[PDB]
Amino acid sequence: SSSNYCNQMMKSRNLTKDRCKPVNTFVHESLADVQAVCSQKNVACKNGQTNCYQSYSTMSITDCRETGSSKYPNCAYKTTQANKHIIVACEGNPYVPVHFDASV
């Protein structure tokens, strides 16, 4: 819990207020462009279910991963910025992303 983007956003978005979550990805794209991935390339999910979809293009993402020294209450994260294709599992009506399956 310090000033880098991952420590700040993991806290603000209520991911580390009561636990340290090991890894989390944030996507820096407009919400509707992230929602548009549910009608893009259909692929199988890691678990073999087939409601996963891969973005046609790469998207700006930040990976946040807990360092080896992190312990609740002071969660500590390494921040890695990258542009990657995201894979999301979709459900509902409207058919929207409900889980992040990976980045590729």
Binding site: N24, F26, V27, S30, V88, G92, P97
Partner: peptide
């Protein structure tokens, strides 16, 4: 209370 779609946005989207 929070739907799964809402939870995905809170945890993963930073428009």
């Amino acid at each position: 209370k929070e739907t799964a779609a809402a939870k995905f946005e809170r945890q993963h989207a930073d428009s």
